[model samples]
Target chain A: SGFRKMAFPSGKVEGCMVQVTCGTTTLNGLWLDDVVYCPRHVICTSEDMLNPNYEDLLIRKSNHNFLVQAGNVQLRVIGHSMQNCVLKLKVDTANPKTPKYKFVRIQPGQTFSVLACYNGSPSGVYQCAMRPNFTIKGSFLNGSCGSVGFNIDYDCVSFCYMHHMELPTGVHAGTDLEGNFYGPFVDRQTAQAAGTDTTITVNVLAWLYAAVINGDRWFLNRFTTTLNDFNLVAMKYNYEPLTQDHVDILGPLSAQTGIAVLDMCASLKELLQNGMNGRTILGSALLEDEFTPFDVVRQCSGVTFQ
Target chain B: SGFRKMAFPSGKVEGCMVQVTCGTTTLNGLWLDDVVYCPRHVICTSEDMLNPNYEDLLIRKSNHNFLVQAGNVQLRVIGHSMQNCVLKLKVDTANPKTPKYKFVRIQPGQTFSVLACYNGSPSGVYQCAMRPNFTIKGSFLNGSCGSVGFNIDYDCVSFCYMHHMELPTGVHAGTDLEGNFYGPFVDRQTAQAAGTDTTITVNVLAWLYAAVINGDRWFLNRFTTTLNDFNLVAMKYNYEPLTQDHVDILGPLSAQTGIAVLDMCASLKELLQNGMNGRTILGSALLEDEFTPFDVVRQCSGVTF
Candidate 1:
């Protein structure tokens, strides 16, 4: 009835909204933090469905997916929004048709995941989202639910008392759970000053910058593509935007040409390559033109329908 | 310098703004068609950039890049904007700090690749935009042209009175050369009925849709990502949107999860994998979210690096 804790890459997961499954239970891809993290140890969340000693798992802090030790049951804040909460949201979605939207209270400058409409449409892929600075940005589209579900259940969001730090560095801009654009952080300081434990702590920005400056152009390009890609992903996935202020701090020279040098990567290249292993999706010259096999597929077919 | 134009992939080269160096000169990634298309022979554009051609190379047709066999010089119709001309797009200008937009005239209901402020700034390449539906699309803050060149070449577009077949098939929408969203082709029928060999020859929709069905989710996802990406690429690279009308026609089930089964396609898989042979880029779970290695890189360091 017990599980172990293993060492995980802490910094990289800070604001990520990734998820995966382990056994019968769904594992929160978001990890816990603050320790000499042991790699030898692996933490298997024992999901006891019989008697749910479940307490609402909250992600109060940005870096860690705070856990809930319900004396008996344990739950981790892993998906798009907070756990054990009602749903309600107001966003700018290009929703199929408009559904009535409802707004909710927010925690100052911190970021929060709200289940505005989690566990719904477009596949078992919930309608909920990962949001930052709720007090400021809350324009989720009314598309989460069908007409009747709007403002009622599906068309909404749910949040936590938890929060994410709005890095003092990088662009002040922010995005909603679905990633709609919001700030210069235009009022970041104001929000932080308004909330609790919401103290400002630098985030993935510096970590990203360090990687940018030290890594090769390929890294820089991948990195470059990441920022731009994050933006594109947000847009394509939910029609939202994630600003690139982090790169803005890069000044000029890093003009997005993003070419990598020699094996200047390879080892590192294999990382994403490993993930790509066997797939023919990314062939757009617009993404990483030269480094992908997609071109060959498209090359063979020539035009669409081929 | 001497070069040979080998039998390149025909259908794939139309209307693309891609560029590469064939030798000393930049070769337009776009290609010319209307032939059995020989694979044995290679046609090389003897780059004599020093003595550039006179008649501006134009892309008059849609499925094809109308070329210019300028007497001595060989210039291909390629790159972001038009080849030889001034620019102007009274488009929804989104210039950096506001340069200015200037609109030109229309040639009946035909589609043209006008330099309408191509190669300029953010909203620069509204080039090749289907004229009839201009006003409805091109809705940025109206910014392009870096001042001095507001109406100049860098801030402009040159064109050919050529045309494109407005297919009676699917979504009546259209994108500019640089891909600033435009048209439901609402007037599509109206425009085509106007003139030139531009009667109507169906664009990329069906071909795109056909592949979607025959392909796997991985391919669908890639296709989905492409339309969106073509949108993103046009956006970051130029600021635009490429509608997924092809999928729009898919009815619905193609919801975009884009999953690939087994080696359901490793040959095809190897194609993209071949390209990713040495790169740590595609780590985001968003694109081909699952199939990538960048995750390991991000995993090893635990963060950005």
Candidate 2:
């Protein structure tokens, strides 16, 4: 069926609202990364949303978790008028040439879900219509409604892939650096216009190589950062293991030179092995209090690819 | 005469070597900002250079005042053996479509002046020809002789009108929280990408407004710094001014802002007075220095309509 017109609250109407949600329950299907609204001409007398809360990749009702939410999708809504309302709805999918959700009808003092959540690229500002239909019997009310718009923020997934690398099976044996990798690379068109060119340079730090050789394996780690800004994704080993070359190169890409991870690990190992000797070490020398006379240790081992 | 078929250093007597002067010179009648060479189908090669120095836009040269200091124009010398060598030079002429100068040809081994240097946006890599000139009857050489091609950069009398409001005016009066009131607003495109989002709140200080009310002035004072990369065109003014609300809401914009000024009068007078005072305060407190030094000062007042 075809859509006719969209409408919202008129004069004397206290409040009119619509709840936006994804059609599917899970984050995978019907999941949108971004949602935008473009309101050409219309009016939203007064809009009041309640229990509006947002999480990492979820926009849901603050009062209830099982209720509606926008998963993996950004949300945006635009209206023509906050007073004396009339407008239309137009949902443009990835292809602006052909709109997936066309014109739809709207009534004042009505509520409906506008966007179904999904996961995708969130870059530009996209708007959607709010008010769709209007009728006027008096000359004072004969005003045409315009379109509504929305600007949804992109939903991002952090550390989506973490368990792909091979760590040592023994309790004392440490995880080696050296492994394959993939990632989410952003293509920013506005970067070049702001003077400095957007470039990604990889520097393989040779120093971190010691840890790899000691662990009897090889791998690389990658660090992604903006060319102009600092505040990096530091020490994000929460993901899979990497090669030594990758760890070496990831450090130089940052604004400043970084230190070697192998040296840090080696120092820790040295102190641990030396603690057994009779000679006193700083760890024991600094503290005089003896609460319990014993040391504590927890170990996990023997896990492999299924 | 059309482009000729020639070779380089052939026993000291070989092909025609034409020196294409990118700017005004005796190299040829071409007084150009850019030169495009599209030969029929001959093997051709081009680089960023005026003489045999092989001037590269990507790399900087010593003692050159040009901001960009490199070339962005591509010269396509067309021919059969050269079809693949068609160079596509994306000239970011402050304005692209309506450029100041275009098209040039310099003889080989000759030098020329670069009118407009490619700064804000630099040029891309050199494209080599795939096939040799079929009509010219020659096989394209692999890396033997320096590939024959044209070299040119752009020149400019003034940048886009939009640039006027984007540059800074170096003068900052009493701390307005964000900074000081200076030039016009920074360029929109640049500010947005710099993460200068609307999230930031702005507040004005006190001293600058006192200078403005007292009829001091301001002017353009260009200065380059190692910080924020390179040369920064900031504004300057006289009078050690106080701050006001205008500088607060407007100062956040000042970080990357510039203003269009037809004349240097009241606008400059106020900034100068404030600028001078600013130096005094900045001097005694920050540097532990006694005297307030300045680069450029505005003596005029605001323009009267």
Candidate 3:
């Protein structure tokens, strides 16, 4: 199945659903016929233990395994909406698949870190990842845990609110905390905007104009090639006529709008003179013709990209 | 009534329409009425003028004005809806209101330039511009018409099609006719994309943005005041919304469409930065709140402007 570009883990991210989004289309890159494995341990959580002033000390102790903010841990189960889910935990190192750990539940967008001490296994570098919940995997404690314990008590490093700071902005270099010196840093909350697949497509048809006005073969080439790809992709799908306005805005066919191609060319020229083996991503000529460094520049000036 | 904020003498040129465009919308200091003065003499249309070759000498035996081809020249006008409107001339310079300058009729999207000329008035020094069919008063001819009877032409300085010479990677230069080459000058034409309003808008908006973002209180105080006047004038009459899409595409509203407050902040930021007094034009902040300099730059980061 992997050979067919339809395999899980091989073609896309395993354990969690992979979403591939492009102009107007959002695809779920996962298959229903695939199986997944789950790792488990008693995942600790700090959601209820959050204290702005105490976070620094609490996080430090949790990392050293000296303090467990919460006795139990929480882990999340990520799978299809229509799948029989279960959790398991891995056990003794002698056995590849067995049980000695415990299963844990996790909430979405939550992260937990633990002080992984594998007995006399030299408490060194330990990596952690969320394991999937599946039908065969009875529970996390059954056989899902990896070589370490769950550290849900610690915050997910991916998105943390309060960060420790010994050297804040505007604080004098040698000033101590009691000196009233501090630097400026803001507490950033996780943006839910990234949770869903939000896509922005910029159709830079300015290359076509560049080809026409400047007679640039590079822009002509890029415009044609890119537009053809749009057409090719459109042919495969049987959808309503994506309004020409919408298509023009999202796909090809949109004129250079108001963007001038000059800004693009100036950049490409600088790139070429720098001895970089770079080609203009867009040009004034169609795709069939050869692209010159100049054409690459002319087209870029005309579009705004995200 | 020729009194205005500022006025400068312009040369006489023959064309279908020869009107000087006022850089400002309102005449702050004084009053002014559009007028076009005539030239000293009239240049008759000679048959040879139709296909004037590169080196052909435009000998005005009568005016004793012999224009030797110091370089080359090409001309086209596009402001209305067509391309390549040519002009006929012969250096006669007889009429005051209409000199030998032939006004090339223009459409909306078409634009052409004269390249390579050193014989007539070298276009290098003159502020080159075009207008449909307007005129001005007092035949504002600033430069001397050559004591003997002529000026070197520089109208040929147009956009470069490609690099004439290869240079080192970082900094380079171009030699003039006298072999005086000194430049790290970024060639705007060849390096720029055709029909791109991006760079233009950037420069314009950078000034606008600086005016607001940096909160140049001074500039905005003037700008907002002038803007009110402009709005009053604009509201007085009905216009065909002349080019609606183009306006939005290049206006401040486009940048601040989603979040009204956010957009307003962005709009002010852009306006202040690109205000005349912010960077290129004035090099001062538009508002009083802004004291720091705006370091806005448009380096070609793989882009054209």
Best by lDDT: 1
Better of 1 and 2 by DockQ: 1
What is the TM-score of candidate 3? 0.19
What do the candidate models score in CA lDDT, each in turn?
0.22, 0.18, 0.21
Candidate 2: tens digits of C-alpha lDDT, residues A1-306: 000011110100000112232322211111111222211111111121122111212322221221122223333322111111111122232322112222223221111111111121110111111111111110000110110111111111111111111111100000001111111111111111111111111111221222122121222323232322211221221111233443454343211223244433333233223432323221121111111001000000011101
State candidate 1's DockQ.
0.01
**TM-score against native, each model:** 0.18, 0.19, 0.19
Ten-residue region with minimum lDDT total, candidate 2 chain B: B290-299
Which docking class does model 2 fall in?
A: incorrect
Give the per-residue lDDT digits (tens) of candidate 1, residues B1-305.
Answer: 00000111111112212222222222222112211111000122334222323223222222223222211233343322332121111112122222122333432222222211111211112112232333211111111111110011222222222111223221123223222223332211243321112211011222222233323233323322334434333334222232444234323322332332211122223323344333322212222211112111211111210
Instruction: State the fnat of candidate 2 relative to the true structure.
Output: 0.00
What are the per-residue Cα lDDT tens digits for candidate 2 across B20-72? 22222111111123322211111112322212222232123221211121223
For model 3 the local lDDT of residue B163 reads: 10
Q: For model 3, state the Cα shift of residue A166 in Å.
A: 31
